[PDB]
Amino acid sequence: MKLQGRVAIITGAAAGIGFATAQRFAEDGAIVVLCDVQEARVREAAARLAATGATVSAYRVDVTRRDEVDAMVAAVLAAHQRVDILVNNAGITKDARLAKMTEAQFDAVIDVNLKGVFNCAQAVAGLMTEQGKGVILNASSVVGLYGNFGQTNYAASKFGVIGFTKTWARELGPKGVRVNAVCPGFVNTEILQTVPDKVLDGMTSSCWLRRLAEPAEIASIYAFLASDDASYVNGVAIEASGGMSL
Amino acid sequence: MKLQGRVAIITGAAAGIGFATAQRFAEDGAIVVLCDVQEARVREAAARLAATGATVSAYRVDVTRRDEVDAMVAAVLAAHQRVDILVNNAGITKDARLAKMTEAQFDAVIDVNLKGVFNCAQAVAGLMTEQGKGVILNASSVVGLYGNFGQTNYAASKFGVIGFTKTWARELGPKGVRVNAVCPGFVNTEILQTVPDKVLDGMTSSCWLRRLAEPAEIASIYAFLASDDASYVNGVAIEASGGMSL
Amino acid sequence: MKLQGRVAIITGAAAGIGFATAQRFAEDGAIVVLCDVQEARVREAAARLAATGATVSAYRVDVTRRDEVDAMVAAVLAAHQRVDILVNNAGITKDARLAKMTEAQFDAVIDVNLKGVFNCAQAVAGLMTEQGKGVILNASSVVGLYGNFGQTNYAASKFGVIGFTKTWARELGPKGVRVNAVCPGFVNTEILQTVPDKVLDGMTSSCWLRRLAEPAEIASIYAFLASDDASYVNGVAIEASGGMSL
Amino acid sequence: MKLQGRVAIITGAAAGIGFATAQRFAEDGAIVVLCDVQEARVREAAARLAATGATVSAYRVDVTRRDEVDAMVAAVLAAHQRVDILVNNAGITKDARLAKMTEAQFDAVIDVNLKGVFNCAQAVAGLMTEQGKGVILNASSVVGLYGNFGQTNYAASKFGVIGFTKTWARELGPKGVRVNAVCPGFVNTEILQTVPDKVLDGMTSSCWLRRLAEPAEIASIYAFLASDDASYVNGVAIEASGGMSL
Structure with missing residues (x-):
């Protein structure tokens, strides 16, 4: 069990890839900390994993609020004495072509997807370099x-993550802390369930495996x-896209 | 005179690569609009180019303030009837190791370097697509x-720019508007004079041409x-780096 | 035992990364076919793995000779009924500055490293697409x-591999056959013992983990x-380099 | 005239991108050496440029025959005393999916497109480093x-070129010799004239400029x-593709 006893914080873990990653990590023996902006849903998620015998906990964290991030990390340290793995998975989309995109759409996405990732990584990276081992996954x-x-x-x-x-891999690598990213293509989470079939067919036609990923394949x-x-x-x-002509 | 009569807006044009680019564009026959947060300095820069016979103008623009960007674009249209080229060159650094970076250091660089580029591109892109030709250079x-x-x-x-x-090249290309980026390496601008010699030796040794660029070589x-x-x-x-091992 | 019962052909398997990969695949339950130009050595390598309880075989294969490749593939099919995995690991270097490189140095490396990879992949790809699953690793x-x-x-x-x-991933992916590559950096195999210390210090200093890989870390x-x-x-x-500045 | 008096060898110059490059180089004042496997056609091409007043010469060169490459380079030195620019443009295609590709198809393309490029670059690179300036374009x-x-x-x-x-840019850069590559997309040369319109429409739909390049746009x-x-x-x-979703 390759992650036995390792403490893993996963953001956006209530559903989707985040939840699939929490499940897989628990199967690999990790102590899993599920974080999400959706409190009720993430506690239900954690409850499902706890029933399997896994050691898990759940926190409501909005990653754009550094005080919530800090409070969670402190609580995890109090409970499990260390942080071994961070998966920066929480993200949002607010799509619009350049001609139509509003400032609020722009800002919201930069806040979660860049500032949020920065907040969580900054909050744990010192713990990891101090212990001489850790991994941050973006x-x-x-x-x-x-x-x-x-x-x-x-x-x-x-792009920014x-x-x-690359920057954190340079800074933290010499201290035994690895930093890597995953670049998923089209993944069959809840976000695709309302997409018209003919649109999904276009998407899968552009994939060299000719199918959508299940979230477990990203996990x-x-x-x-x-x-x-x-x-x-x-x-x-x-790149975790099956090969793509995007 | 490959840019004869074309109207080019350049941000960060008071000095460095921005000024060299304004100079070169004027040499190639462009009407150049020099924009900078340093108003006195960008006015003096424009005056040097006007003395060579170029058609130029000079505006204070804080690219993080969309009303200022919009007002400048409106003024350029009033004066020169169209906008042909945008060079999004304004940028800042606020360097720190992840361990030490403050929220202000982080936020400010994202604001100027991503939000500012967004603001200027959004402000001109409709003008360019409406006329069926334009180019945005980031x-x-x-x-x-x-x-x-x-x-x-x-x-x-x-990374984000x-x-x-790529996104804007996809959206705007079909309307005749090209979008490209330049990735400079180490350039002998004013920001390097204060830098220690042994730091600059490390810079030049990592460049396969074994020298720094002059700003004109990026322009x-x-x-x-x-x-x-x-x-x-x-x-x-x-990539405009002479080749390198960074 | 994630590769249990799967038949894997590994070229260049007598030593180095190839042997480490054979060892790991056997540890994961694969039936391993070790191929190398060094027959006595690859036979001894296979014997070490068989002593651990693995199901293995050992063939002399010069990947530049398609009849030898084909004969080996036919023998594997006769023995194990299918081919599930190909690891195209055989390669050589014949280093020289452009100014000095001989035709033989050039031709030989293209022959083993491109033609050999082509030969092995072409020899197994039809078996894999016919059965609807396979993986080729270059x-x-x-x-x-x-x-x-x-x-x-x-x-x-x-570069060519x-x-x-990418090409084979496009052609074969729709049939259920994945094709991927690994790009190792500096690996502590037998080819490095003779190398000077100051050359190896330059290697490790350019790696962001500040150490060489063990072959098992590529396997x-x-x-x-x-x-x-x-x-x-x-x-x-x-890229399997620990991060680097080459 | 930015290439005034500079001696440029261009392979595959009888037609297509090669000829368009010869024409443009002559317009920029270069001394142009047109090389092609097609002797009559390349002499006609050269004759067209000579009529404009340009200084040009023509050679039959099969780039896979190093003796022909060497003889041409010697003749150019005898005539013009130096070589300033090499454009390695000669190429061929022999397409087939992996399942069907023959050894001869494979070999022919590697011979022209890799060995040929090596031959021409090796033959001129020493001349360029000795004079302290040159450029090789692949x-x-x-x-x-x-x-x-x-x-x-x-x-x-x-990929291989x-x-x-990158290798030659590293080796030759310190001596004042630059090496770069161009990666064209779909270009409207003779090779596309028999392609069905509906197939061309698919190609242009995948281009973010929604049109094929004219060869002058690569030149x-x-x-x-x-x-x-x-x-x-x-x-x-x-990349000179107009942006592509390939």
Whole structure:
């Protein structure tokens, strides 16, 4: 059990990729800390994992509020004495082409997807370098490699988290702390359930595996990167798109 | 005279690469609008170019203030009837290790370097698509490709502007408007005179041409990209580093 | 036991990363076919793994000779009924500055490192698409991302295998066959013992983890990519360098 | 006239991008040496440029025959005393999916597109470093960035020439010799004239400028890169695709 006893904080863990990652991490023996802006939902999520015998906890955290981030990290240290893994998965989209995008749409996405990631990483990175081991995993996107129509704000933020990744991999690597990113393509979470079938068909046609990912297939990449199997993987952004013509 | 009569707005034009770009664009026949937060200095810069016979103007613009950006664009239209080129060159650094970076250091760099670029591009893009031709050139950095120690905020921002570049190239290209980025390496501008020699030796040794760039050598890349010689170059980030090992 | 009963052909398996990969695959339950130009050595390597209880076999294969490749594939099918995984790890260097590189130095590296990879992949790809599942893993290098002094031929070949990877991921992905590459940095294999200390200090100082990899740390990446944990990873080249400034 | 008096060797110059580059270089004042495997056609091409008053010469060169390459370079030195620019543009395609590609198809493309480029660059690079200035420009492709169905051989070769580019930029940069690559997308040369319209429409739909390039639009990028406007551009592969979703 490759993450046995390791303490993992996962943001956006109430549902979607975040929840799938919490589940997989618990299966790999991690102590999992599920954080989400949605308090009731994340406590239900944690409750489902606790029933399996896993050691888990749940916190309401808005990652744009550094005081909430700090309070959670302090509570995790009080409870489990260390932080071994951070998965910066919480994100939002507010799509609009440049001609129509509002300042509020722009700001909201930069706040969660860049400032939020900065807040959580800054809050744990010192704990990790002090103990001489840790891993910070950042959620990017294929859009963070290639751009995408209507995603001025999202693309900037997901490119930007690769900037974080390479910078922190440089700063923290020498102290035994690895920093990597995952760049998912089209993943079959709740966000796609209202998308018209013909639109989904266009999406899957652009994928070289000709299908959407299940969230567990992104979780499994975070699990690899957290584990010692990725001990010489640092500063990378792994594309998890099945291959794409975006 | 490959830019003859074309109207170019350049931000951060009082000095450094911005001023060199204004100088080169004027040499190539462009009508140049020099914008900077340093009003007296950008006025003096414009005066030097006017003395050579160029058609120029000078505006105080804080790119984080959209009303100021909009007012400048309106004034340029009143004076010169159209906008053909935008060079988003204004940027700042507020360097710190992740461990030490303050919220103000982080927020300020995201504001100028991402929000400011968004503001200027959004302000001109409709003018350009309506007339069926235009070019937006974004200043990135080698740091926006590879990250860099102490530059959590700057690296996120310069990665992010490549996200803008690809996204806007997708949205605007079909309307005849190209969007590209330049990623300079180490440039001999005013910000380097105070830097220690052994730091500059490390800079030059990591460059495959074994020397710093002069600002004119970055200006000439912007001039190429603005010109019709780059008519099939869209969505790219051109590294202008002499080759390097950062 | 994530590769239990899966049949893996590994080229260059007598030593180095190839042998470490065979060892790890066997540890994960794979049936391993060790191939190398050094027959006695790869036989001894297989014997070490068989002593641990693994199901293994050992073949002399010069990957530049397609009849030898084909004969080995036919033998594997006769023995084990299918081929599930191919690791194209055999490669050579024949380093020289452009000024001095001989035709033989150039031709030989292209032959083993590109033609050999082509030969092995073509020999197994139809088996994999016919059965609806398979994975081909190609050995690249950080040199296949950034180039390197004295490696005109090697760099072309390791860039080229990423070209293969993306192309085959496009052709074979829709049939259920994934194709990926690994780009190792500096690995503590047998080829480094003779290397001067000050050359190795330059290697480690350019790595953001400030150490060389052990071969098992590259093997574990191949093991991940072969496994179902990488089921939505297709067409990628994963840098396995600890982060670096080459 | 930015290439005045500079001696430029261009391979594949009888038609297509090569001829367009010869024409543009002559317009920029270069002494142009047109090389092609097609002797009658390249002499006609040269004759057209000579009529404009340009200084030009024509040679039959098969770039896979080093003796022909060497003889041409010697003849150019005898005639013009130096070589300032090399454009490695000659290339071929022999497309087939991996399942069907023959050894001869593979070999032919590697021979022209990698060995040929090596031959020409090796033959001139010493002349350039000795005089302390030169530029070598390599023709890659968008396929050398992203791969493409049916192009195992072409993609490997055009990735591979970026490997050459980065390696030679490293080796030769310190001696004042720059090496860069251009990666064209879909260009309206003779090769596309038999392509069905509906197929061309698919191609242009995937282009963010929604049109094919004219060959002069690729020539203009080579002209920039050869000129002193690109004096701090070294080791780069410039995508000239209009933006693409390949």
